[PDB]
Specification:
homodimer, 37% helix, D-3-phosphoglycerate dehydrogenase (chains A, B), Rossmann fold, dehydrogenase, binds 2-methyl-5-phenyl-pyrazol-3-amine, 9 helices, oxidoreductase
Chain lengths: 195, 195
């Protein structure tokens, strides 16, 4: 609410980090390396962004990423297609979303219906090389399925602010070279903190 | 030109990384740590971004950052104030720019008039804690003065894609905890690469 923008901003930061590998590049530079070929990245302009959850945060991510020329599609069981259309997000059924996306971000509560929203079965329906962001709640993305998808290349990268357990006891995702992460920083701004 | 968007995207990446310390945070996570308090960040909405150089890349950065609610001001010796106004950048003389900015980004060629455009003198005229980006040409920002500004806290952070020497032989900037960096990745996208 106060914190809608802090979360939305982080999410968009994570999207740009996935496209360009800024965290990995910084660590390479700090280790004395100059690795130009390794961190060849991708332009966001023209790419499809799937937004799952079209409440305040989802809407704010949408309008920021639209300024980059991203095509913004999404799903929400509750928000009307008229409302989402008013902020430029084309709503489609989930099964239609998966194959279209270059990026996917999640902006849902953690409910039975949203736990492992992204799992083995939904990763299989994505475009190969999809990139995924979870700055919402840990568990929305099944962590085992994400690791399997990163191992195969089915997922090319992921940005995680939240984890099923916090801090995560299993370090395989954090340790993966194509994973960027923060210690649940989504509301951690000076501004969000004072209403 | 092809590559205007690749550069502009990287610059906006670096702005978001400075606000939220995403590269540092990822390193912290990869080192096994969960340091939430340490990486308290800042919201971009409502902040002032100064854009020095209002050509194609500067413009594109402007319109993207404007979607985050940033106030975009700037300076260019060639572009008229009515023209910059038409893409939402308020032009002011340089001396007026320094004290207003929360973030500064440079988008100039490397000329005598732009080498060390940011130096000891212009850092002193900035707001304490200014954050700086150079995704343009190495040397626009005086590297020595930038280090001194980071050491004093006058500059709270910097993001560098380019260096006076590449790879940089002097490692003090790169190694600083508030500096994020890439190995000259501004045009390093699959898309920019094929015209
Ligand atoms: C109850 N509920 N469910 C969602 C949802 C679930 C799956 C995908 C997108 C959105 C959002 C809310 N508030
Ligand atoms: C020739 N020139 N000079 C600049 C400049 C100079 C000082 C400050 C900001 C921008 C940009 C271009 N194209």
């Amino acid at each position: 609410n106060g914190n809608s923008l802090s979360a939305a901003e982080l999410t968009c930061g994570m999207i740009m980090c996935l496209a360009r590998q800024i965290p990995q590049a910084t660590a390479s530079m700090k280790d004395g390396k100059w690795e130009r070929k390794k961190f060849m990245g991708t332009e966001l302009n023209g790419k499809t962004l799937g937004i799952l959850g079209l409440g305040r945060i989802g809407r704010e991510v949408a309008t920021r990423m639209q300024s980059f020329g991203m095509k913004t599609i999404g799903y929400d069981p509750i928000i009307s297609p008229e409302v989402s259309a008013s902020f430029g997000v084309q709503q489609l059924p989930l099964e239609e979303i998966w194959p279209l996306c270059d990026f996917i971000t999640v902006h849902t509560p953690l409910l039975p219906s949203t736990t492992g929203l992204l799992n083995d079965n939904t990763f299989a329906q994505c475009k190969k090389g999809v990139r995924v962001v979870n700055c919402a709640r840990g568990g929305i993305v099944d962590e085992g399925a994400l690791l399997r998808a990163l191992q195969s290349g089915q997922c090319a990268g992921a940005a995680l602010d939240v984890f099923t357990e916090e801090p995560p006891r299993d370090r395989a995702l954090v340790d993966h070279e194509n994973v960027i992460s923060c210690p649940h920083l989504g509301a951690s701004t000076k501004e969000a903190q004072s209403r």
